């Protein structure tokens with residue numbers, strides 16, 4: 001029942017939340033005990049509210065407020081206009097660099113997802129129907145393995161236990177795969193010497209002979225080291241992700257690697273694709289709607305990759321059920337997204353949405369068929385995680401700073417090997 | 418009122434039509450007295466019918482029937498799936514070459530447009546709202562000028578008169594621009610010697626000092642000739658379109674031309690973009706939803722161009738009101754489509770849709786705000802143009818064959834100069 005056949009934005013509520021995260025290691029530090037996210041509730045003059053989810057660093061929250069103010073009074077179907085208004089509001093210029101356009105896309109993304117959610121709700125269509133329609137019923141995900149301590153310093157150890165060697169990594173895989181059924185496995189490396197990470201990979205291969213395997217050391221290696229690793233893992237990895245820093249280095253490694261190289265670090269914005277393509281630095285690009293500017297722009301990224309002969313996967317950061325629902329609709333509607341998607345899901349145990357719509361079964365999530373994004377806010381859960389945010393005092397993600405608070409001389413050097 | 422919240426295709430009616438066309442000249446011949454199109458009426462189990470419009474050559478009609486049969490039983494929101502089914506049905510492989518994928522896109526396009534029309538109708542949204550939303554209220558078009566005979570042989574001369582020199586071309590512009598208000602002007606060249614076409618361009622510039630101007634000889638020139646033309650028209654043309662054949666030749670000319678080069682001939686499919694981009698052959702690509710695979714894929718083309726630093730315009734072939742409505746919604750929703758679009762509109766005087774929704778005023782068409790494509794079939798007009806198709810006996814477009822039926826020794830050689 002829309003006057004003037006118009007459904008437009010009346011305001012947005014941005015709610016920062018914090019949820020428990022284990023001490024997962026990576027090449028620059030260790031995860032803090034709480035990860036942060038911002039929930040966007042986008043309100044309209046039809047009484048329909050759409051959901052989006054993004055980062056929650058201090059500067060980002062400020063940008064999210066400026067954005068929320070700039071788009072009041074806009075149709076939820078006018079997402080092109082909404083991006084431009086956010087660009088004007090941020091005073092933006094509309095490899096691996098966060099350009100002004102990259103900032104605009106990170107700020108626009110959660111509003112775009114919330115807009116599509118409202119679009120789906122008002123039309124009776126699932127979000128995947130707004131993206132060309134689902135091409136598969138369910139979206140497969142990977143088991144995202146990390147070396148980890150047993151506990152945050154001075155806190156109760158979690159149920160995972162530590163993983164600091166091949167045995168520990170294999171036990172982690174077994175527990176994760178029994179609970180979720182993942183049929184592909186990714187190891188976060190750049191933490192131990194390459195030979196020890198190769199050994200974890202070989203051990204996973206022996207324990208799970210049919211699981212595709214990936215390794216991502218976040219550019220912790222020189223090109224010369226990366227080529228040795230790639231030779232040593234020939235026929236073992238589905239792809240090698242960001243072994244070494246920079247497009248030139250990646251191109252050098254790619255020329256010698258028997259498996260494809262993937263990246264999320266060198267290509268995080270549209271303006272970075274032409275150089276990545278010209279240099280042959282990578283064969284697979286990891287999508288991520290959270291920094292590419294929402295779902296429609298992620299579909300554009302997928303079409304560009306297809307056109308230029310690049311494979312397509314999906315990158316993840318610690319996230320909750322709103323992001324998960326958006327990931328699933330996006331992947332369901334993307335013909336060339338055939339790699340299993342990364343997710344941090346197993347690492348959290350809290351959420352802001354009502355349960356039931358995002359069950360994993362055999363490693364995959366069925367795409368919801370209901371109108372909109374397919375999940376709804378649980379206001380009590382949201383208030384609780386907001387309260388947790390206020391009380392835990394963490395205001396920015398800082399893996400390195402947190403590592404230094406424990407080990408003051410720690411450096412986030414790289415490459416390390 | 419959709420059972421299972423499902424609206425799916427029950428069948429398609431393909432109706433070939435023919436409408437009067439003047440004897441317009443181009444570098445390969447002269448237009449036949451009737452141009453051909455196929456109207457797609459896409460029927461659904463909700464009783465909503467969507468409209469699409471495409472070519473009507475013999476082989477294309479056959480492909481359109483195979484496509485219509487393959488997609489019965491599919492949701493109009495499942496356009497990704499529908500393209501894949503058409504690809505399977507055609508047994509397809511899913512510069513300027515008509516690859517199997519290009520064939521698939523030409524066949525899919527009118528069904529995709531008809532699907533979006535149904536989507537808009539069922540959701541209450543104009544098609545532009547399905548493409549990210551309009552960013553402008555009206556879409557500007559160009560005056561598409563041609564050298565022409567006074568009449569088809571043995572027929573009544575049309576009201577335009579002949580145009581065979583600069584004076585005739587200027588008089589044609591004046592009549593067209595008084596009727597339609599176009600604020601940009603394009604000349605179809607490759608018909609007379611370049612020096613005479615340069616003179617028509619200079620005469621248009623003198624007669625319309627503020628109108629952007631374009632010239633397109635359909636690759637009738639050598640690179641050396643093209644550079645002379647471009648030097649001689651420095652500061653006069655908004656772009657020079659397809660002056661010379663092949664990506665290498667275009668790149669040679671582009672390096673010396675003071676204005677951007679445009680193309681529709683060298684880049685007509687997604688698989689042709691990487692080489693065009695790598696060679697620097699062009700600065701502007703002409704979109705055309707009729708062969709790029711419908712509106713969503715045209716939005717993808719627009720995003721690829723934006724990403725790789727290419728300007729975006731729009732190409733046209735003789736067409737009716739269904740294509741016109743689709744062109745307008747597409748252009749309204751495309752932020753980087755800022756060149757005036759080409760259209761053959763002034764050259765016909767017949768249509769298959771009810772009048773009123775596509776008025777030109779000051780060179781531009783307001784984007785319809787109604788649900789769907791915004792135009793509807795006039796069944797009497799459609800029957801009449803179908804009857805005209807059957808009776809006129811023309812079954813394929815053949816500018817060269819028709820020129821030879823008048824002048825047997827005629828050759829479609831090129832380049833000519």
Ligand SMILES: [Cl-]
Nearest residue numbers: 073074075078
């Ligand atoms: Cl608006």
Ligand SMILES: [Cl-]
Nearest residue numbers: 490491492495
């Ligand atoms: Cl279907």
